Amino acid sequence: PQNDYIERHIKQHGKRLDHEERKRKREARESHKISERAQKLTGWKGKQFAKKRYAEKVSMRKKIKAHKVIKTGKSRSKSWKRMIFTRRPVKMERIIRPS
């Protein structure tokens, strides 16, 4: 805590003795990982990955420019009412307009 300790601790003691090299190795491996993920990641995840990759290519291309029948009552045979403001009496109205 106390206002950016992490940055102060890094300044006082630095990163791991094998942090930068591992980061560079991971950056190099990023291309292989991306290539593998395109063939892998089946199912719906593949669709999202492909869409994101295509969007990324779109960003590079953009930046290249650097410079009813109703039955009522206790019977199913009374198919009288219908369905599509002082609603009319239900016994009188034949067409019902839902609220």
Partner 1 sequence: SWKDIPTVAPANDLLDIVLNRTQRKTPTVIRPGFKITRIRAFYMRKVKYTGEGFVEKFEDILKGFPNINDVHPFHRDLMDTLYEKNHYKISLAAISRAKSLVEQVARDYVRLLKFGQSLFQCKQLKRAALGRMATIVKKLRDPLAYLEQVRQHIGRLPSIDPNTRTLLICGYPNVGKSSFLRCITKSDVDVQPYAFTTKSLYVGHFDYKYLRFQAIDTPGILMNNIEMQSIYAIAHLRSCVLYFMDLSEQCGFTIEAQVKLFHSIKPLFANKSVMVVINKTDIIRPEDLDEERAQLLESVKEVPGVEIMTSSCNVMEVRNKACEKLLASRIENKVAQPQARDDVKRTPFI
Partner 2 sequence: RSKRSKLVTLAQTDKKGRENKERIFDEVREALDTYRYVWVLHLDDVRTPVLQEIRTSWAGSKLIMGKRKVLQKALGEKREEEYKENLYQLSKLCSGVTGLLFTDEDVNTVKEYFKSYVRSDYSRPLTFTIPEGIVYSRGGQIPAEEDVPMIHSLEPTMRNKFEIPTKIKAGKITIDSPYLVCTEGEKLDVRQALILKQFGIAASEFKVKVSAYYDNDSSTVESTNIN
Partner RNA sequence: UUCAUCUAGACAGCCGGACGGUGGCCAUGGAAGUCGGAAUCCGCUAAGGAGUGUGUAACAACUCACCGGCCGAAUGAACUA
Partner RNA sequence: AUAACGAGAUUCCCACUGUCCCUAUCUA
Partner RNA sequence: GCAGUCAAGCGACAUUGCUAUGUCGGCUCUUCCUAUCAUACCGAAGCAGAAUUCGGUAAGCGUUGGAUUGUUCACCCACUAAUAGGGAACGUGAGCUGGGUUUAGACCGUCGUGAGACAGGUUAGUACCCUACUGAU
Say which entry of partner 2, partner 1, RNA, none residue 66 contacts (CB below 5 to 8 A, set by partner kind): partner 2
The phi, psi pair for 81, rounded to 5°, reads -75, 165
Of 12-20, 49-57, 73-81, 88-96, which part binds partner 2 (CB under 8 A)?
12-20
31 is written with which tokens?
């291309």
Integer Cα distance of 74 and 20 in angstroms? 79
Integer Cα distance of 26 and 19 in angstroms? 10
Residues comprising the chain, all counted = 99
Subset of 20-79 contacting partner 2 (CB under 8 A): 20-21, 31, 63-64, 66-67
Contacting residues toward RNA, per CB under 7 A: 1, 4-7, 11, 43, 45, 54-55, 58, 61-62, 68, 70-78, 80-81, 90-91, 98
